[PDB]
Design a protein around this ligand. Structure first.
Ligand SMILES: [Cu+2]
Ligand SMILES: [Cu+2]
Lengths: 128, 128
């Protein structure tokens, strides 16, 4: 626990939280994602992606343009600090990243890149 | 216009009108739906479905459970007064229903039954 969190994205297009603070003593931080529900990945896919607030739009945009095969993310997009894979119902994925990639005083947002899902599936992350 | 309306569902999960009025003189009424943009049916499908405000949730829940192959609508759902098929970008569909299936003093709702979309895509229909 402490440097980790569990996120669930369901069939009603929602995440279970919209805010995450990362404790400044963490060297690394883990996100674990599971998709409750019965719908397939091609109709209700979810991933947890991270970037600063000012680049979220660019990532969602470039992400949509790359297709379901690239899990709706642009390959080697250097605005994406961290990201999971796109997962369907009953699947799960985890990502660990380096906390020194964040700095205190900058605003970060987590979100899903499936088309349209970022309207309700988005939230803040902050280094405290 | 005269006893019919032309409506659009776009790539942002938005319909372009959110209240429809049906005048009592009309024996029938027609709705013509188009979907501008470029996303396919499985990622951004849309339909126009009508029920009383009371049956919307029962219809939205059963439709999600019917699958993309059943155009996310329960077959022969007795609560649906009228509907179109589920279209992707570039496509189009229309429907004409009898105005005698509506009654004065009841509240009706139109919505898209694609999973996750009916929260953003809905509006009122009133018989005046
Ligand atoms: Cu999603
Ligand atoms: Cu829709």
């Amino acid at each position: 626990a402490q440097c980790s969190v569990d996120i669930q994205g369901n069939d009603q297009m929602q995440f279970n939280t919209n805010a995450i603070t990362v404790d400044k003593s963490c060297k690394q931080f883990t996100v674990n994602l599971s998709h409750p529900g019965n719908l397939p990945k091609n109709v209700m896919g979810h991933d947890w992606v991270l970037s600063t607030a000012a680049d979220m739009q660019g990532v969602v945009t470039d992400g949509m343009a790359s297709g379901l095969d690239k899990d709706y993310l642009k390959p080697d997009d250097s605005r994406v600090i961290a990201h999971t894979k796109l997962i369907g119902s009953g699947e799960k994925d985890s990502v660990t990243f380096d906390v020194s990639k964040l700095k205190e005083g900058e605003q970060y947002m987590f979100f899903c890149t499936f088309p349209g899902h970022s309207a309700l599936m988005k939230g803040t992350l902050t280094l405290k």
